[PDB]
Design a protein around this ligand. Structure first.
Ligand SMILES: Nc1ncnc2c1ncn2[C@@H]1O[C@H](COP(=O)(O)OP(=O)(O)O)[C@@H](O)[C@H]1O
Ligand SMILES: Nc1ncnc2c1ncn2[C@@H]1O[C@H](COP(=O)(O)OP(=O)(O)O)[C@@H](O)[C@H]1O
Ligand SMILES: [Br-]
Ligand SMILES: [Br-]
Ligand SMILES: [Br-]
Ligand SMILES: [Br-]
Ligand SMILES: [Br-]
Ligand SMILES: [Mg+2]
Ligand SMILES: [Mg+2]
Ligand SMILES: [Mg+2]
Ligand SMILES: [Mg+2]
Lengths: 487, 461
């Protein structure tokens, strides 16, 4: 917490909030439920006013119930049925409508109630909250957020890795002291290699999606030399390395780890596939690992957001030996190309070598294509009968008979027997402990800048992003330090 | 704290404060310095912002210094002088005034601390959540709190037009005196002009030696006044340090009245009440008179027999000097258990003509000063103060500073185990203009006192 940069984070007077009150889109779903500080302040309100008292505590205890470890769950539910649902009880929710109330005296979830309760809280109490000091403080924070936080605010302190157009650094947000990854894209070297359309898609995606299994874009700015991206740091390296450079002699992961890492990659893929995006570049080496032992997918630079009401899209692009046959041919394909790759990853994780390819036989794109479009998958004796069946499903060629995304979900994939020792609820939660925690050991000249480029660079350098900023603020405990009334 | 009436005390939404923002007069001197919750919220702001950090603590430690017991005082001052290039050094202080502190009273430093705080930091504060909360409170205050909110629980005494009750503010549970004036019995006895002057005065002045008007409303039968309860010097007669102490307060109360151009006119033991702590406050202002804007002296015959000064008894241009004369009669009657001019158990024209070894040489000389006839050679109010009275030798074992404060031990704590009338618009119109309602400062006190301000001024439990 560097004193000078920390002292910059200071709430503004109320007159500097006019503009936001209008300019801000924020209504309920976004403000009080989606945004960390908004949820915080909205609940601080609900807390301090007695009428909402029960609705808040019912709202909280449902959340706690959903992230409750299996062996507690049914106990907590009993206690919750008592505190908030029992007729003529102390914190009895009266606003709940008979039908919905008596429904929650049956069950293995409390999902109607969260809808029923937030439907309420968003209606009137939200309006009471809008006409309150808390709301005004909420703006105060939305302002502080909107202030400029560029390359000044980030101390680059280590090299996490080399990328295409520049080094990915590890860095600390000078003010709050939170460690981020800083992916730096050289301005000239982008232009020269005609990579705008990529670099941008990545910025647009990472900042658009928020999920624990994708890297999260926190900040995005330019320098006079590079376009930087600040994103959830991933010290743990990447799945490729952690096959071939952990126990070099005894290669690859054991089945529970391979499954667990797939589990997250699947959940991350789903999130992308629910928002009509094709990852297109799935492979171990772009599936990063955090300090805690969990994974997140990365390098969206060759992703593609399918268009508003678009079933499938064309385009040739990807990694050799990970590209699905229907793509390799060059036809109308959809999400099913990613799941194909997923299987190659789950194969290579366990086997320490690609499915179709041997180790040390690097070859032609037309040769490997034939090896994809026409070859049967051989599975060694390291596999279990569950894993073999899973991979086969993902590694088929025909996308109308390949396991993947169906009817808004992957639940058809999740039921597959391979996922026995898995609590999907907790996986999406964060509770589930990972099995393995890590511990690891100029240019040419020609392209000068024009007006037409810089307008992109600024449209790239969006700035600080709402939710991940608000997290950092609460995370680092600067929100506490600042959201104070009577010391 | 009656749950139903306590639950009425609830801060309003910010939309119900627009009106007050304009309708309220409140600027700095009044808001942040004079009003309890305003002072509170203004300080909470100063506290939560780092830049003002020192100025708030200097501002607090000066206050604490002024109310500091003699034997600590100079120690605290040294510590305060400590707290150039220092940790919480006030930089905004101007070199000249900065020196003063060393070259010794920190009265003019406070006057330059507040000069600052009221300038810019106040403007920062007006553009803050704390100011908005301040209005929230000013609104709750302005809501109607009539005869509903007061449980009458005992009779403190009988008055002219009705019984003075002891009562509790149902919501916060604070004990008040409830002086009830019967509407018909006022009118019939032509007492409006009086009853009103009293309401106007008690609510106008705020001092620890005068009763304080908290609320004032009407019922369908009476005009009520809620005021600082006082569970009287007359009864408590029928020693010199006590007589002096009681006078000391009565003088300080009289000064406050005399600095605001008012003559009490009805000074006598029996209307100088005593609180549970053992301190006194003057009372029954009904025959007072606020001298007019740029008015030296006023006429009028009114007062209590054997307490009225000669220059008044004649009927001439008189001023505050009539009160001080009475003061002396009170100090005489206190020590002697009998009036000065009059014996025990013995006409207005006779007493007018008329207008021991228990005394000390200091008391005798004080009384004689107050009990002289000629008001141009009588001890009293001079050039904006009574300091000429305060220096008189009778006030030896007296720390005036602490007397005004509240610190000084009272030399005696009491015992805690002791038809034919019709109304018109012209009347009702008065009764409403009498029934003003709840009063800013004393209300805001009650709220902090009873700790409902804490319970309500909450942010994150
Ligand atoms: N958020 C991150 N945390 C830790 N390391 C990262 C992060 N992002 C990238 N890296 C490292 O830097 C390398 C290059 O990043 P990448 O985005 O894959 O470059 P490119 O977009 O040119 O493919 C990766 O192989 C990885 O090891
Ligand atoms: N605040 C109080 N607390 C307790 N008793 C009081 C209080 N105020 C007045 N009393 C008692 O009630 C009596 C009537 O009030 P007072 O002002 O004397 O009536 P009037 O206005 O007719 O002179 C007083 O003499 C005193 O004994
Ligand atoms: Br509020
Ligand atoms: Br580190
Ligand atoms: Br392969
Ligand atoms: Br504020
Ligand atoms: Br607080
Ligand atoms: Mg890469
Ligand atoms: Mg890339
Ligand atoms: Mg009386
Ligand atoms: Mg009277």
């Amino acid at each position: 917490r560097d004193r000078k940069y920390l002292a910059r984070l200071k709430l503004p007077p109320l007159s500097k909030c006019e503009a936001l009150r209008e300019s801000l889109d924020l209504g309920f779903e976004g403000m009080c439920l989606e945004q960390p500080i908004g949820k915080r302040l909205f609940q601080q309100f609900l807390r301090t006013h007695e009428q909402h008292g029960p609705a808040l505590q019912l709202w909280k205890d449902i959340e706690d119930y959903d992230t409750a470890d299996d062996a507690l769950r049914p106990q907590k539910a009993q206690a919750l049925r008592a505190a908030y649902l029992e007729p003529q009880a102390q914190l009895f929710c009266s606003f709940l409508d008979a039908e919905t109330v008596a429904r929650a005296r049956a069950g293995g979830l409390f999902q109607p109630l969260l809808r029923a309760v937030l439907a309420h809280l968003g209606q009137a109490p939200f309006q009471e909250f809008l006409d309150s000091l808390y709301f005004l403080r909420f703006l105060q924070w939305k302002w502080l957020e909107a202030q400029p936080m560029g390359e000044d605010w980030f101390l680059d302190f280590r090299v996490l890795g080399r990328g295409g157009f520049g080094e990915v650094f590890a860095c600390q947000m000078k003010a709050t002291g939170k460690l981020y990854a800083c992916k730096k894209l050289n301005k000239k070297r982008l232009k020269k290699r005609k990579g705008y359309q990529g670099a941008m898609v990545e910025k647009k995606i990472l900042a658009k999606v928020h999920s624990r299994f994708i890297v999260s874009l926190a900040y995005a700015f330019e320098t006079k030399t590079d376009l930087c991206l600040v994103m959830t740091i991933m010290n743990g390296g990447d799945i490729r390395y952690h096959i071939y450079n952990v126990d070099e002699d005894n290669p690859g992961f054991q089945e529970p780890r391979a499954i667990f890492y797939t589990a997250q990659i699947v959940s991350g893929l789903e999130h992308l596939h629910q928002r009509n995006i094709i990852y297109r570049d799935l492979k171990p080496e772009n599936v990063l690992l955090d300090d805690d032992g969990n994974v997140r997918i990365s390098d969206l630079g060759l992703a593609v957001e399918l268009k508003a009401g678009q079933t499938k899209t064309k385009g040739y692009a990807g990694t050799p030996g990970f590209m699905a046959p229907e793509l390799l041919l060059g036809e109308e394909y959809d999400f099913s190309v990613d799941y194909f790759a997923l299987g190659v990853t789950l194969y290579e994780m366990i086997a320490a070598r690609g499915p179709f390819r041997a180790r040390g036989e690097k070859v032609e794109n037309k040769e490997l294509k034939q090896r994809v479009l026409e070859q049967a998958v051989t599975y060694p004796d390291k596999f279990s009968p569950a894993s073999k069946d899973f991979c086969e499903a993902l590694l088929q060629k025909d996308p109308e008979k390949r396991l993947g995304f169906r009817d808004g979900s992957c639940d058809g994939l999740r039921t597959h027997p391979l996922f026995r020792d898995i609590s999907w609820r907790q996986l999406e939660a964060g509770m589930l402990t990972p099995p393995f925690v890590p511990d690891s050991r100029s240019t040419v000249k020609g392209v000068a800048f024009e007006k037409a480029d810089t307008e992109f660079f600024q449209e790239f350098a969006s700035g600080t992003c709402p939710i991940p900023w608000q997290e950092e603020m609460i995370e680092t405990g600067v929100f506490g330090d600042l959201n104070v009334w009577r010391p």
